[PDB]
Design a protein around this ligand. Structure first.
Ligand code: HEC
Ligand code: HEC
Ligand code: HEC
Ligand SMILES: [Cu+2]
Ligand SMILES: [Cu+2]
Ligand SMILES: [Cu+2]
Ligand SMILES: [Cu+2]
Ligand SMILES: [Cu+2]
Ligand SMILES: [Cu+2]
Lengths: 457, 457, 457
C-alpha cells in the first residue's frame, strides 16, 4: 500500500492560492482528497539585494523565496509552470516530497514564453523545499529559484496565532559585501562555497525593522523555515528565546525545547515559538559572521507587557543588531541613486552616513558622538577630527592606536581597522559626522577614500 | 556489565568474506557469537578519479571506499592488516565501533611488505566508518583510506530486497576539476577544506549510468551510507523520493520519512527506500555545487510499470543530470589517452565532445543543436558558428550577449561564460559541433583554446 | 503557564561559585528555587594559543572558554558583568536559555572599568552557550568570548563519577598555523570562515598530555561540550569509544549509543561516557584536518586493568596523536623565547626539535631515526644527511623522490613535501637530528630555512 491512500480526488478541483513571503496560505481545512491546480510563473528581474546593490534574481512568482504552496497529504496536484516571455533562460522544478524522478524536473522544462504541466500525488506529509533543476542547477538556485511546499497531515496542523515563511539562502556576487551597483553572479565564489551575502527572504533587511514579523505576548507562532542553499548549512537559532518544537520535512521525530538546530542545504523545518516577554527575537544562522557580517538576520517583534520576574532588561539595540536596529536604511538607497545620477548632495551623504553609523561606530563613540571620557574619544565637536579629515579616513580604514589627545584629554587605546567598509560607506559616515555635533561641515567623497585606501598612512 | 555480553565465541572460527563497493556481504544469519578473522590489504595505486584524470589512491582492499566488513554484535574480531610490498607509506586502521584506544591504530601500524594483527570484541551494534590513522592522517584519509564495518544486532537487520554500499568523500587535486593528467594531492586545498572533487565511491560516474544501482517497483532497498570526509558534512538527499528510515551509527534514535539528512565527517547511516514508481533516483550532497559541479551524485534506477496516478512525468534527463544522463563518458577517456599518445583524431574529439555537450550545452541549444527560434540560436548548420570558429571559442569561455543574427533571425539574450571548462573540453565540444549538423568540419585544439583563454576578445 | 513555574525564590540568596575549564561547579543539590547572584568579569589579555604563539584573547573570567555557571531551572539569576579597567573594548553578554531580547545583551553593555546587571528567570533546563554580543560580534566571539551555563532540571542530573567542561572554537590569526609571535586577529579569514586554529579550551594542547582529563575503568564521565564557533560546526567524535547518551541544549530528545554527532555553531550538548578499557580517548572535530592539522583534539585518559577479551592492542602513540603524544612541548615555548631574546642555543633548538619530530618525522623514520632498511632510510648516523645539510632543508620543505643511497643501501620511494612547517620548526627539527644518533652536530637556523624556501632546488 502507498502512504496517503485516502482514495480518489473528490469535491471540485481547487485552484491553489499561493502567498508571497513572509505570508502563508490559510490552512486547507478539508477532510477529503482533492485535485489541486497550482500555477507558478518564473520571472527574471533585478531587485535590491542590499541598499544600492542590484542583482538579477530568477524567481518563482516574483519573490525570493518563491510563492508558498499549501496542499493536503493525499491530494492530486496538477502543477503548471509558466516561464515569462522576458526570461532569457529555460527553467523547471524539482519539488521535494514528489514521488517520481527529478521531483518533476523532466516534465516541467519550460523555455521563455512557454508553459509546462505535470501531475503528482502528494503521498508524503511535511514541509519541503522546491527549487529549479535546470543546468547549471547551482546557478539557478543561487539566483533565487527556491521556495516551500507544505503537505499537511490529513487532520491539519494544530491551530496557532500566526504562521510565517522564512527561507535562508547563500548568494554569490562578483563585488564584495555592500559594494554598490548591479552585481553579477560569481561562479568561482559559488563553487568554492564562499558567499558574499547570506540572507533570509532574498535581501538584507527583508525581515528587520519595519519589515519584522509580529506577534503579541501569549501568542503562538509557527514558522516554516527553508534553507535553499545552494551550499550552506544553517546553525539556525533564535536569540533570546527557545523553540517549543522543531520538525524536519515530514519526519516522525519532533525535537522539543531547543534554541539552535542544523538545517541542511535543501532542507526545511517547522518551528514553533510561544511569546513570553516583549521585544525583538532574532532568527540567525549562528555561524555568526553570516548573521552579523553577511545579512543573515530576521526579526520576530513581540508586543505586550514586560514581566520583570522573567526578564528585567531592555529591548535590543544597535550594539547587537548593528545598523538594522532602525526601521530601515532607505537613505543609503537614496544616496547611491544620487551618486549614479550625479546629483549627490551633502545632505544625501549625511542621511546615509547616519544610517550606517549605528552600531558600526556608535558602539564605542555613542549615538551622540560623546564617547566616554578617557576611554572612547568624542566624535562630537572633535578637535582631532577637524584638524585632519584625511587622517580620519585613514583611521576608519586602517584603525588607530597609541596615545592621542582629543578635546584636551589623553586616550591610549585601540580602534580596530574597518577595511571591509566600502569607499562610499566611509565617505558617507564621515560626512555625517562632520555635519553633526558642531563639527565643521564639508564632505568626504568616495573618490577621496579610494585614494587613501590605495596609499595607507 | 558490558554491552554485547553474549558469552564466549562458539562454533568454528569464521573467515570473513568482504565485498567491494557497491556490494555488501550477506547477512551473518547466526544466533551465536563467533571468532571472526578479517584480512584486509592496503594497496596504493593509480586509478581514474574522472575520465582522463588519474590519481594515486591509497586503498583498503583495492577500492574506494575500502572492502565492506560485516560481523555480529558480541563477536570477537581478529583483525589482520597487510600492507602490500609496492606501498611507499606505512598504514594502520582505526575502526569506529572498537572499544579501545585509537580504534586499533597503535597495534595495526604496518610498514610496506609487513602484516599486523589485533583482536577486539564488537560490543556496539551499528554501521561505522573505518579509516587509516597514520600521520599525516588527513592525507591518508584524503587519498581514499576509508570504508564501512557493519556490526549487526544479534537478531539481524530486517530482510530487504537489496543492500548497497555508498560512501562520500572529498578530494583535493593540484589541478582544477576535470583538468586531465595524473593529479597530485594538494595539501593546501585540503587544509582549507576546498575540495576539487566530491564523490561517491571514489570516482565521477562511479554510480551513474551503466554503473547505477538497481531495483524494481515494490522492492525495498537498504543503503549503508558512509562519509569518509576528510572534511565535508553531507546534506545527504534522495531526489524524487524519501527515506523510510534513517539511523546513524548504532544510535537508538531512528528518524522516519525524511528526504534530506546531515551526515557528519567520519559518520555513517543506514537508510531504507521503498520503490514506488520507475525511474532514476539521485543520491546527492545537497550542498548542491558538490553534486552538480564536483561529482557528488549516484543513481538508484528503478524498473517497472508507471503509475500515472502517482506521477505523470518522465524519467530524468541531461537537463538535471547533465553529462551523466548517458551510460558512460568513455569517449573522454579515449580522447585524453590519444592526446597523450600524440594520435588524437578528429573523430576522437567528436565523440568526446558529444559526451560533454549533453546538459552543458544541450539545455539551451538542444541535443540536435536546433535551439528554439528567436530564443536560443541554433548550433545546427549555424552560419554564425561557421563564420568565425575563434569567436566560438571566446563565446564558450567568456559568454555572449547583445543582439546577434543567426540563420536569418535576431537573438537578443545572454549566454553565460563557461570558463570552468578546461581547454580540451572546449576544444572537443566545438569539434563535435563543427562535425555535426551540416557544419563545416575541421577541428579546434586544446592549444587553440589555451591561446583564447590567455587573451579574451 | 510558563515553564519553570516553581514559585518565588526561597531560602537565602546564593552567590554562585563559578569554575574555570575544564572543571564544573558541584551539582546544585537543592529542592527549592533560589535567587542566584552571578558575578563575571571580562579580562582582555595575551595568552599562548600555541607554543611560542601569543594572541590577545578577550575572556569571561580570564579563561577560554569562560567560567562555567551552574543554576537550577526556576531560579532567579541576578547577573553582574564587570569589565576590567585594563580593557580597551566595551563588552556585554547574551546567555542562550534566557527569555528576553538579546539574551541579556542590551542591559549588560559594560564599558572598561564599569559594571552592569540584569535579572532573568531560568525557565528552560539545559546546557547553553553564552557569549559576547558587542559589535563587531563575530570579532568578540572569535577572540574567545564564550562559555557555558547549565540550567539543571529540578531533580538534578543523574550522579556520575566525573564532570568536565570542553568547548570548541575556531580562531583566525594573521599568521599561519604555528607561525611564532604575537598574532593579530584576521578579519578576512574570519569572514571567509577559514580558521588558522580550531581548538578545545583556547589553546593547542589545552587538554592533551599532562593536561588530559582523567577517569578510571568502570567510571562514568559526563562532558558538557560547547561549540562557541564563531563559524564552524563540529563533527564531534570520540576516538576508540562511544557516547552512551548525547543531549543537545535542553532538548527532550536523547540520542544513545553514537560515536559522531554534529554540534552547531553556538550549540552545546551533554555527553556521557563509560570507561571500559584503559588508554587515551580522543575528542575531535572529525572534519579531520581540524583535529590533526589545526589543534582540535582533547584527551580523556583512562587508568586501570587491560581486558584482552575486549581489546588486545596498545595505547595511542605519536603515529595517530602526532607531537601531542608527549606530556607537553614546553621546549618549543623555551626555544621561541630564546630566539626573541637573542640567546638561542644549540641545545634549545635540539630540545624543541625533539618535541616536533614526534609523529611528524618518526612515523616513517622511527623515534630512534633507524628507519626500516630498504623502505624508510635512516636519519641515525646518516651519511646522506651529513653530506649536505642544505639538501636536507630542501627535502623537508619540498620532499624527495627517486633512487638514493643512504648508508650503503638503495631507497626508491617518496617523502612528501612538508611545506606547512614554519622556518623555525624545520630548523629546530634538523638541529635535533644533527645532534642525535652520532650525526655531526652543528645547527640549522630559521634564516637558513627562509633562504631555501625562497629558492627551491
Ligand atoms: C571601538 C571598538 C570603536 C569603534 C567601533 C570605532 N572607534 Fe573610532 N576610535 C576608538 C578609539 C579607542 C579611538 C582612539 C584610539 C587611540 O589611539 O587611543 C578611536 C578614534 C577615532 C577617531 C580619532 C579621534 C577622535 O576624533 O575622537 C575617529 C575620527 C574615529 N575614531 C572615528 C570612528 C568612526 C567614524 C567609526 C565607525 C566607522 C569608529 N570610529 C568606530 C574606538 C572605536
Ligand atoms: C543557455 C543558458 C545556454 C547554454 C547552456 C549555452 N548557450 Fe550558447 N548561446 C546561448 C544564447 C542565448 C546565445 C545567444 C546570445 C545572444 O547574444 O543573444 C548563445 C550563442 C551561442 C553561439 C553563437 C551563436 C550560434 O552559433 O548559434 C555559440 C557558438 C554557442 N552559443 C555555443 C554553445 C556551446 C558550445 C555551449 C556549451 C559549451 C553553449 N553554447 C551553452 C545560450 C546558451
Ligand atoms: C614517510 C611518509 C616520511 C615522513 C613523514 C618523513 N620522511 Fe624523510 N624520507 C622518507 C623517504 C621514503 C625518504 C627517501 C625518499 C626516496 O627518494 O627514496 C626520506 C628521506 C629523508 C632524508 C634524506 C635521506 C636520509 O638521510 O635518510 C632526510 C634528511 C629526511 N627524510 C628527513 C625527514 C625529516 C626531518 C622528517 C620530518 C620533518 C621526515 N623526513 C619525514 C619518508 C618520510
Ligand atoms: Cu531556473
Ligand atoms: Cu533538491
Ligand atoms: Cu594510510
Ligand atoms: Cu575516525
Ligand atoms: Cu566582548
Ligand atoms: Cu548566540
Amino acid at each position: 500500500k502507498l502512504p496517503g491512500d485516502f482514495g480518489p480526488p473528490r469535491g471540485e478541483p481547487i485552484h491553489a492560492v499561493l502567498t508571497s513571503p513572509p505570508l502563508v496560505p490559510p490552512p486547507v481545512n478539508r477532510t477529503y482528497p482533492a485535485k489541486v491546480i497550482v500555477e507558478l510563473e518564473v520571472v527574471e528581474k533585478e531587485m535590491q539585494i542590499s541598499e544600492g546593490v542590484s542583482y538579477t534574481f530568477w524567481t518563482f512568482g516574483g519573490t525570493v523565496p518563491g510563492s508558498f504552496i499549501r496542499v493536503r497529504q493525499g491530494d492530486t496536484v496538477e502543477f503548471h509552470l509558466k516561464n515569462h516571455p522576458s526570461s532569457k533562460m529555460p527553467h523547471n522544478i524539482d519539488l521535494h516530497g514528489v514521488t517520481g524522478p527529478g521531483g518533476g524536473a523532466a516534465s516541467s522544462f519550460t523555455a521563455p514564453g512557454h508553459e509546462s504541466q505535470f501531475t503528482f500525488k502528494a503521498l508524503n506529509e511535511g514541509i519541503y523545499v522546491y527549487h529549479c533543476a535546470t543546468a547549471p542547477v547551482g546557478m539557478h538556485i543561487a539566483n533565487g529559484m527556491y521556495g516551500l511546499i507544505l503537505v499537511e497531515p490529513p487532520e491539519g496542523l494544530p491551530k496557532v496565532d500566526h504562521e510565517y515563511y522564512v527561507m535562508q539562502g547563500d548568494f554569490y556576487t562578483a563585488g564584495k559585501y555592500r559594494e554598490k551597483g548591479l552585481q553579477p553572479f560569481d561562479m568561482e565564489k559559488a563553487i568554492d562555497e564562499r558567499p558574499s551575502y547570506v540572507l533570509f527572504n532574498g535581501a538584507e533587511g527583508a525581515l528587520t525593522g519595519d519589515k519584522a514579523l509580529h506577534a503579541k505576548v501569549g501568542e503562538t507562532v509557527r514558522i516554516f523555515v527553508g534553507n535553499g542553499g545552494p551550499n550552506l548549512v544553517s546553525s539556525f537559532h533564535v536569540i533570546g528565546a527557545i523553540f517549543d518544537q522543531v520538525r524536519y520535512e515530514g519526519g516522525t521525530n519532533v525535537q522539543k525545547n531547543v534554541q539552535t538546530t542544523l538545517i541542511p542545504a535543501g532542507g526545511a523545518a517547522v518551528v514553533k515559538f510561544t511569546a513570553r516577554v516583549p521585544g525583538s527575537y532574532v532568527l540567525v544562522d549562528h555561524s555568526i559572521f553570516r548573521a552579523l557580517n553577511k545579512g543573515a538576520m530576521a526579526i520576530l517583534k513581540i508586543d505586550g507587557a514586560e514581566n520583570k520576574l522573567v526578564y528585567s532588561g531592555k529591548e535590543l539595540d544597535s550594539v547587537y543588531l548593528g545598523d538594522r536596529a532602525a526601521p530601515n536604511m532607505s537613505a543609503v538607497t537614496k544616496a547611491t541613486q544620487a551618486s549614479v545620477s550625479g546629483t549627490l548632495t551633502v545632505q544625501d551623504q549625511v542621511q546615509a552616513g547616519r544610517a550606517l553609523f549605528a552600531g558600526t561606530c556608535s558602539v564605542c563613540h555613542q549615538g551622540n558622538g560623546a564617547g566616554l571620557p578617557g576611554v572612547f574619544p568624542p566624535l562630537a565637536k572633535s578637535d582631532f577630527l577637524a584638524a585632519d579629515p584625511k587622517r580620519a579616513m585613514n583611521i576608519v580604514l586602517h584603525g588607530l592606536n597609541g596615545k592621542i589627545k582629543v578635546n584636551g584629554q589623553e586616550y591610549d587605546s585601540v580602534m580596530p581597522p574597518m577595511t571591509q567598509l566600502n569607499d562610499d560607506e566611509v565617505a558617507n559616515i564621515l560626512t555625517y559626522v562632520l555635519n553633526s555635533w558642531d563639527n565643521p561641515g564639508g564632505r568626504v567623497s568616495a573618490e577621496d577614500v579610494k585614494k587613501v585606501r590605495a596609499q595607507p598612512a
